[PDB]
Design a protein around this ligand. Structure first.
Ligand SMILES: [Zn+2]
Ligand SMILES: [Zn+2]
Ligand SMILES: [Zn+2]
Ligand SMILES: [Zn+2]
Lengths: 49, 585, 133
């Protein structure tokens, strides 16, 4: 009982760890592309004459 | 993702109940949440029950159910709690140090900044905790600014005088110089900024940066700004050198800056230096002789207020080349004789909040007393300098503390540089006062300068003091002493020449009444700092801690160049004054 | 023709009056006002005919200047289809404040800014109209 209650828990804990890790990575890439897009627009606008 | 402000360990946990959401390690987060009422914790996803229509947000009452956070009521059979094993579940759980004591962080995070002890702890905690405390205090001040009600122009009596209708259900901020409002105009579906204003009781007399023909509809709100998060320490680590490092002194110097030459060399002896300059000692003279002593050095002159930066620019126009000086102005009328927004110029004059990320040979930060740890930290973050020169006076006014109500803030707790120059002493000192007469210089030197400040001028025999309590009346946010103003009237009638004097009082209402009845120009002690006048008439108007403050009294009495009359309500300061006693008529 | 003239509705009605005066079904110069899909087709046919009259440089994106945070932009706000006529955006925002991710995504996709920033091109290798490089 009290071992089947535990050894099945580290699996779900580990996969939750991995999930929120990749979610944080994707969220950071989101900010990266936001910055890149905005700076591209502001650099291309300066040529407008 | 970030680093535990108490452990520096890489962490993905932030406290959701703390206003600044600081990064905390698993152990530190656990100890903080179990020791305070802070139960909301932020991760890359906030620690809140995701059940439909559930309000459980406490970290100790949540479990990892499947792929989500659930309370005990809504959890699936397979779950483990968020808050367990003396740690908080999150990223980088294996890498965690923890802290033996979380008392300082808990106190800083949960304090309302209404006690002097909060500021003492902020100035005496760890450097990262100093940054966190500065962030929290500034954010709390900004939020408290929003607590004030909106004042709307209800009817325009005349020019420079208004009538305000205030928002119901919200408090009214005091109408003085410390609360600068901003006017807003009504449009179709939006709002436009029409200038920054200050108010006083008349009906309200308004002083705006720009003049207008404003009518009913315009309403004034104290503008608040986002508080950016601090990364650099309030002071760089101290380094002492054996030779002038990064600087090359000129071989020819004038007698105007000779007396500071040795101190200039001390600037090259260390990474940063602290200068204590009493009133009328030549802090600007020292700051500009630093540049003239190192002509090739690129120097950034900074100050919290636009006024001090403008004064530095005025001195630079006097001694420094105009083409080598540039005044940085963000997108208030300031110095406009240097080229505007030129970062790469050799001499860069800019306020704290508008500084660019740049390097320099010397960074001269003037008026350290008005500075906060926030300003020092952000200056260190943006400016990379071989040498830092902190210039000011711990015996003068600090930045006003609106939230502080219990206790008084000592000069050592104004900022980190203030702490250094009050505990270990300033790196160098300006010991000659060229402004005030001998009586005032001796008085201030015995009061706040440990009998070190010396007098350049002789006794002027025009320094007078009177002990007169009078009658104290209180309005919404100030104090009035009419009998003291009547005594000043009698003195003016018996001494008409003193009608050239400038009235100074620690209260704005007393200044308004004195301007109305006497005709003299009127100054608060807070706004009189940095200025000087031939003759000064000062009334204490109370015996409260505000008027009896030694730094405030020093600033008030150091504004006189020739003569001063002092109507004292406090016996301590009256006896401390080395002035000629006068009798009440 | 004037280069800056983009709405040729009056000319379309004039042509329809001149050549198909007694054609019973109603005609919509801009396909927005159609009653259903069949009327869309029926108007699109006559528009395809009449689009061979007007200059090639009046078909495409319709640009307008909009300031964001005080910065003047050049963004697409309408289109001139050869077959559908003139269509105007309904949710065009003028003098906005901040650009969210969707706003940046849209304003980085349309050829408005890219065309307005580039330099004029003239290629002799083909016959199709060319915009820029
Ligand atoms: Zn907290
Ligand atoms: Zn920690
Ligand atoms: Zn729940
Ligand atoms: Zn139709």
């Amino acid at each position: 009982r009290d071992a089947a209650m535990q050894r099945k828990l580290e699996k779900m804990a580990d996969q939750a760890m991995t999930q929120m890790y990749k979610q944080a990575r994707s969220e950071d890439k989101r900010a990266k592309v936001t910055s890149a897009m905005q700076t591209m627009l502001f650099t291309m606008l300066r040529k407008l004459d | 993702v970030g680093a535990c402000v108490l452990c520096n360990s890489q962490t993905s946990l932030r406290c959701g109940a703390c206003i600044r959401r600081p990064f905390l390690c698993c152990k530190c987060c656990y100890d903080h949440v179990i020791s305070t009422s802070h139960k909301l914790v932020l991760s890359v996803n906030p620690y809140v029950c995701n059940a439909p229509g559930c309000d459980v947000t406490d970290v100790t009452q949540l479990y990892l159910g499947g792929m989500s956070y659930y309370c005990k009521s809504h959890k699936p059979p397979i779950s483990f709690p968020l808050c367990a094993n003396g740690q908080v579940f999150g990223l980088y759980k294996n890498t965690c140090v923890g802290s033996d004591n979380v008392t300082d962080f808990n106190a800083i995070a949960t304090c309302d900044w209404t006690n002097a002890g909060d500021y003492i702890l902020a100035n005496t905690c760890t450097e990262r905790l100093k940054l966190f405390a500065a962030e929290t205090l500034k954010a709390t001040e900004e939020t408290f600014k929003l607590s004030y009600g909106i004042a709307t122009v209800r009817e325009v009596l005349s020019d420079r005088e208004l009538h305000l209708s205030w928002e119901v259900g919200k408090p009214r901020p005091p109408l003085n110089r410390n609360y600068v409002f901003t006017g807003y105009r009504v449009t179709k579906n939006s709002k436009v900024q029409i200038g920054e204003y200050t108010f006083e009781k008349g009906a309200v007399v308004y002083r705006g940066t720009t003049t207008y023909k404003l009518n009913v509809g315009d309403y004034f709100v104290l503008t608040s700004h986002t508080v950016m998060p601090l990364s650099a320490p309030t002071l760089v680590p101290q380094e002492h050198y054996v030779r002038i490092t990064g600087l090359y002194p000129t071989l020819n110097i004038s007698d105007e800056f000779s007396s500071n030459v040795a101190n200039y060399q001390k600037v090259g002896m260390q990474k940063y230096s602290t200068l204590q300059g009493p009133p009328g000692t030549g802090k600007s003279h020292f700051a500009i002789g630093l540049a003239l002593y190192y002509p090739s050095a690129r120097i950034v002159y900074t100050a919290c207020s636009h006024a001090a930066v403008d004064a530095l620019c005025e001195k630079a126009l006097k001694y420094l080349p105009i083409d080598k000086c540039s005044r940085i102005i963000p997108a208030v009328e300031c110095f406009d004789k240097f080229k505007v927004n030129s970062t790469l110029e050799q001499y860069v004059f800019c306020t704290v909040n508008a500084l660019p990320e740049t390097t320099a040979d010397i960074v001269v930060f003037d008026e350290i007393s008005m500075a906060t740890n926030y300003d020092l930290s952000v200056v260190n973050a943006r400016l990379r300098a071989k040498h830092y020169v902190y210039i000011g006076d711990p015996a003068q006014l600090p930045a006003p503390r609106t939230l502080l109500t219990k206790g008084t803030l000592e000069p050592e707790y104004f900022n980190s540089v203030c702490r250094l120059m009050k505990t270990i002493g300033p790196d160098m000192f300006l010991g000659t006062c060229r402004r005030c007469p001998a009586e005032i210089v001796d008085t201030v030197s015995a009061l706040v300068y440990d009998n070190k400040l010396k007098a350049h001028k002789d006794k002027s025999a025009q320094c007078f003091k009177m002990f007169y309590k009078g009658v104290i009346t209180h309005d919404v946010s100030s104090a009035i002493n009419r009998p003291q103003i009547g005594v000043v009237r009698e003195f003016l009638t018996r001494n008409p020449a003193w009608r050239k004097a400038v009235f100074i009082s620690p209260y704005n209402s007393q200044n308004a009444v004195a301007s109305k009845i006497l005709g003299l120009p009127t100054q608060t002690v807070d706004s009189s700092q940095g200025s000087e006048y031939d003759y000064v008439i000062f009334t204490q108007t109370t015996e409260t801690a505000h008027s009896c403050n030694v730094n405030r009294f020093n600033v008030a009495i150091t504004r006189a160049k020739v003569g001063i009359l002092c109507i004292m309500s406090d016996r301590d300061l009256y006896d401390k004054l080395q002035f000629t006693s006068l009798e009440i008529p | 023709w004037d280069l800056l003239k983009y709405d040729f509705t009056e000319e379309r009605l004039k042509l329809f009056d001149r050549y198909f005066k007694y054609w019973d079904q109603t005609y919509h110069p801009n396909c927005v006002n159609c009653l259903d899909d069949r009327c869309i087709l029926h108007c699109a046919n006559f528009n395809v005919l009449f689009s061979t009259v007007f200059p090639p440089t009046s078909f495409g994106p319709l640009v307008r200047k909009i300031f964001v945070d005080g910065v003047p932009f050049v963004v697409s706000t309408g289109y001139h289809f050869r077959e559908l006529g003139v269509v105007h955006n309904q949710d065009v925002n003028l003098h906005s404040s901040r650009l969210s991710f969707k706003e940046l995504l849209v304003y980085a996709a349309d050829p408005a800014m890219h065309a307005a920033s580039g330099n004029l091109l003239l290629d002799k290798r083909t016959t199709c109209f060319s915009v820029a490089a």
